[PDB]
Symmetry: D3
Subunit: 258 residues, 6 copies
């Protein structure tokens, strides 16, 4: 469509990386309903596009996304909430992998949106935080849940109770993010990692992703049994036969996505 | 009351931080029943004090606490356990946040009491450990559970099976504690974090704390749903209206704990 | 027996440590059905030897193990999977502690084998990875489950979806391994950790290992209650009464394994 | 809208109950994609109607519904499944209560659809079953999960593994259904149970329905604590003050749904 | 003490049974704060009385208990709940078994109190219900959790969403209660069950009770393992050795509660 | 082999049902190690037999099994249990369905062995119980877990804490067993049900069985998703195509176990 709040581009080898860029820089990309509706639309389009194997989500160089728009919630009631932040986690239902390339601020709903991605790459000056407590509320889209599971009780409690930000280097050391890149090459490096993934078999990559996600939803006993079943499933695909022949016949693999 | 084994003080801005100091230096604050009874009293008194928004728990410079009291345990039988270990985890039922400021030894029951706190700050010479195995027993107040969830299986196995101590630095790197301070300022630094948590609304802070804790008790799916209900609940308070107004109007929020 | 693929030896003080070494260096220790079978036999023999209190598992300098054997798997089918990698987790059923000493490559099934040990020590040049996705399959023995639980979602997703390796240093920082040592002393350092475990009471150590393992199978509430029960159980042993009388009596405990 | 497969109607005191009637009896209400989409829209419409407080779902007199449409499924593949039957559980996302009035056959997808409702009333000649196994497949929409949790392992295994049907009386005795009525008054009796529900506050009913559904997603300890939060949240509503004043003042309650 | 709203007595063979009778019949046993505090005291006194091995909780003939007390809840606010019905589940922490003998009404808080006992015996005219919804609130002490787990989703949803009562016979058929007896001998029949329990070893009974309770708190795999460790623990008591010796020696066991 | 304690035969149409009869009538089939060992061999042999699709497990007319062997357990110690019950749950790892046909007593370990089967059919004079508590021990092979999940808390507590037996009719009413047959035809009836099961595809039957068992190990969300995956799996098989072709061609299906 004609997007007012984001820009999308297809990037990388063979146009296989979908790039979604939040673009509301005077508001440092605060998450408003308008922008969320567009993000959701773009994610669905990329998800349905057969040439796209992975998505990179990024913002501007000073901010991935600072916050939601407070003015937009300022006047709601308990009843309003309860009976009526609904479309905020559509990103968790995409099957293809999604990499957040975070430069600058990722705060509040912004930190949450990044944690919902499968992988996070941070720029050198990135900063993460959940300042919701400073506004008299608490994180409402996994900020108390995905953060704690990544960084441990002590650091998550400190962040959620004080609102204090942490640096890209603290995030990486704690495992909230897995690489740090220079500011000017962040998105390009995220695009390469996405390309590498997109070169894999899509149906296998989707099973792997589902398998890793399952580790937050099951005991280890049941997570292993699920994994084992996804693993048996891969033997029903041509890609599995091809990847393994390629290694025996010492050649490169040619996946076809089934 | 007139405490035999602890000292309590009110501190920080407006006396908003309750300080509790273990004070049985002759036994390196070994946690005998009597001391635990006084601790639980001091915590309840803080909890009920409307001036108090956070608590700091600390020992002396040489030990936070060197464990449960081995002398009191020596002569117990399997059958004493059964029909008889009891008020050891009252601290987990306090709604207000509790920060452990650990200088020196925190071993066995003492490491466990620190890990039950929301946040741990460590002094430069602090040491953590679970030496229970060296007495022919295992950790009995979360030392195999909270430790493992903070530092990973490999280090928690190594600590629990050998009894080896780790440093403050190793504890920080592993996410068991979140900051390290010089010995002589640790307690002051912990009070400053406490005072920051105490400036926020007491009822919102209690909710946020409940939400974070819930990351250890449910799948990520039901944790996100429970957080969302608590987020909705915030919109039932005056302090949520006041915080959101203050952000929009760009002024200091004046929270009144409801 | 007469082993083709591994070498076993008894080591440490009084020969209390069973060492198992994978020995199929022309395939970089690839884990074929034959070798898994021997490995399982060697594990059962050490578990049954009353002289052995802990096991070290290791490979060569260049590789701990490069994976399941891709040539045996090549012509498997979805129905073969279903109706017939079955003894692949026998190691998780050994009650005595097992430490992986990983030099060089630990990839795919080899990374998984290491992650199933209680403790991992890594050599300076070690590398961990899950390159299954490059063959059109996913990790099938815990590599989406135990990895995620040790290193966090972001790093696990990146490793499983790209197949990229991580260094020993990255692995320690993320808590997948708990110590790093020079290539040449690695095994010796692992035998020392093992010998220390072996000096402790075998019954309490088996309990303490169970308890730590429970942290991935239950909520924190229930894990604490199971631990408490096993902690009560220790009071049924001679070793528990000795270990604590020793401390009180200012003398060396002498453990009898009961 | 112009519905092919279902009929809808408002019923009961003040048009408070929305009635959805599946209406493809030349195929015994076999649930083809077409019918599901229609079903799903009707559910949404009643969900958004501020006059309706409960929905009654029902089929014809001889079949509630005899499964998904075996002819639509005949030629699908394993890769079709993976990459491409999907809106089957929209009903689980409706917040208002939904009662299944089941006359005649409710088999396979049909039995699943009824088990996804909150309440099931059965006509005297109703029959429930999961005959998937007779087609070479297994239940795919909760038939091995919701059935087993309602009837116990022995009866579920017998049903799933043989395909045998059970009677309305066996279903009530086992707790899969909760009342039995004559074939010819079943719908009207469901409607009167729905109107009783619709007389209660709509926000409170939604909270209660969520509490009860959480019994299948959490341990009891966590389900109690979630329940407790929803219970406290009711005190933020006018409806609660109103129901409770009306008891005290011995008068009827007048609820406003907030 | 000198009780205002309850009566206690010791009954059974050798006065081995503590009987607690709720006694506020002019409010049908509405559970005000005051009565809750005396119940809790009486429970604690039987728990510590070494002559008592099991407790029987009953009410009057027309009512066991009609609920929490609506006049004391009437003016509470959301902030009251929050930063404030707290000692309501002390009965769940008593180690000795508690049997509810329910004659007459057990509604709302009163149904919940009975579901918190280990065993419920119902008189012929008893009725069970959760009418909270009719007051614009939801059950707040396990009514949506313990009821659903006993009777299945359909019947719990119907009860919680309509407020309708069910009979003693429906409750027994659904497994909410496990015996029905005549109104006039109900309490003596419950005493008989408690005396039988009290003749058994207290320590093994307590462990059996904990093992049954674990069935609502973990997966079947882990509850089997918890149970196995409790079963090994029994072999530390004299009573277990006595119990089996007596079977093999063809004589009566004499238990000694250890 | 030459079994001392059991008898096996193949039965039903096409000899498709493996019948294992416990045959140690002078001890009422008390389950000593020797008998468990033979039991497990007989089950493995039927598991591996491509003509067998289901197994019927039975005892004699007077006792299915009266428990673990009290004579063998008498002189065990705490410490024996630690290091040394072990192959007691091999039956739970069989993929083919197992039906217990219980005539007469099934008590203690014998009630537990029946509950470990997928389906229980009971003779008219069968009796179920957990009399462990009368020997000073608790159930140790699922008696506090599988029982409670089948019959609800109240009846399970009453059985486990008193040792009282329940009839066949009480068991069927509570959902512990799914059908009652006359004593002299019970085995023939169970074999007929096994024969139906064995008419279906063995690979689809095994997946159906694994799905149903999953209901005890996962929240409903994750149980539904695992089931979905299994459902997709079936589309990789020939039997799924054949069964669904057969309905539509209105002929009888010809399954080939793949
Ligand atoms: C449910 C919870 C269960 C918890 C279970 C547990 O925590 S089991 C407990 C686990 N923790 C312990 O095993 C650590 C035990 N303590 C030590 O190992 C050591 O004290 C230490 C390395 C920390 C410090 O050695 P030092 O030589 O500096 O100090 P020293 O040992 O002389 O201690 C000073 C005095 O405190 C006493 N003391 C120290 N630790 C104690 C303890 N846990 N229980 C009782 N008393 C203790 C001593 O015995 C000595 O008293 P006297 O010389 O005057 O007698
Ligand atoms: C349930 C579990 C499922 C597990 C599934 C898995 O683990 S799937 C497995 C995942 N792991 C594998 O993908 C890693 C494959 N291996 C490699 O990429 C590479 O070998 C390497 C990166 C380790 C290093 O390569 P190098 O070039 O240094 O060494 P090179 O490739 O010459 O390998 C040395 C010899 O070992 C053999 N070999 C190496 N890895 C093997 C493996 N995993 N399975 C079988 N055979 C293997 C190769 O064929 C060459 O054998 P010949 O020259 O005699 O033929
Ligand atoms: C993800 C979710 C997955 C769900 C997957 C599933 O539910 S698998 C589906 C499971 N359910 C099915 O097995 C039930 C199949 N139905 C039956 O076995 C039988 O129809 C019956 C026992 C229900 C009733 O038999 P009767 O003899 O009275 O009626 P009869 O067999 O003639 O059926 C009446 C008409 O309905 C059609 N029909 C009935 N059930 C159907 C189904 N599931 N798919 C499509 N068509 C069906 C038939 O083809 C016939 O139409 P025509 O004569 O015009 O052709
Ligand atoms: C955390 C936990 C939360 C728990 C929350 C709850 O249990 S909420 C509460 C839920 N339970 C209630 O909704 C049930 C309320 N009660 C009723 O519906 C009805 O009393 C009844 C069907 C039980 C019986 O009706 P009867 O007509 O036979 O008796 P009747 O209504 O005249 O009342 C007898 C006297 O008892 C008092 N009474 C009855 N139930 C009460 C209650 N739950 N709390 C306060 N007082 C109660 C009434 O005021 C009247 O006193 P006066 O003569 O002085 O006026
Ligand atoms: C991990 C799993 C742990 C499991 C733990 C358990 O199952 S503990 C086990 C729990 N189950 C038991 O408590 C039930 C024990 N048995 C009884 O209560 C009773 O035998 C009975 C009520 C079923 C039937 O009484 P009757 O008098 O008809 O029959 P009787 O008692 O004479 O049994 C006939 C013969 O078999 C023997 N016998 C019966 N049950 C036995 C058992 N569980 N272990 C060993 N031997 C047993 C008797 O000792 C007797 O042999 P001799 O006369 O030669 O002596």
């Amino acid at each position: 469509a004609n997007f007012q709040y984001i820009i999308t581009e297809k990037k990388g080898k063979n146009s296989s990386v979908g790039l979604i860029q939040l673009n509301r820089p005077k508001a440092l990309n605060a998450l408003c309903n308008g922008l969320i509706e567009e993000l959701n639309q773009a994610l669905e389009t990329f998800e349905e596009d057969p040439a796209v194997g992975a998505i990179v989500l990024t913002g501007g160089e000073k901010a991935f996304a600072a916050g939601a728009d407070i003015k937009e919630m300022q006047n709601r009631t308990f009843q309003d909430c309860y009976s009526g932040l609904s479309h905020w986690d559509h990103i968790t239902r995409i099957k293809k992998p999604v990499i957040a390339a975070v430069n600058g601020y990722a705060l509040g709903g912004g930190c949450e949106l990044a944690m919902m991605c499968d992988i996070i790459y941070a720029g050198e000056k990135a900063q993460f935080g959940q300042p919701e407590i400073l506004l008299g509320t608490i994180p409402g889209a996994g900020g108390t849940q995905r953060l704690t599971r990544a960084v441990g009780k002590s650091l998550a409690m400190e962040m959620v109770l004080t609102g204090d930000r942490i640096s890209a280097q603290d995030a990486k050391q704690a495992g909230l993010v897995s690489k740090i890149f220079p500011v000017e090459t962040l998105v390009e490096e995220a695009i390469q990692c996405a390309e590498k993934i997109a070169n894999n078999s899509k149906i296998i990559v989707a099973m792997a992703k589902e398998s890793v996600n399952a580790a937050f939803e099951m005991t280890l006993t049941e997570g292993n049994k699920l994994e084992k079943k996804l693993f048996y499933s891969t033997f029903a695909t041509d890609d599995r036969r091809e990847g393994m022949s390629a290694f025996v016949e010492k050649r490169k693999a040619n996946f076809k996505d089934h």
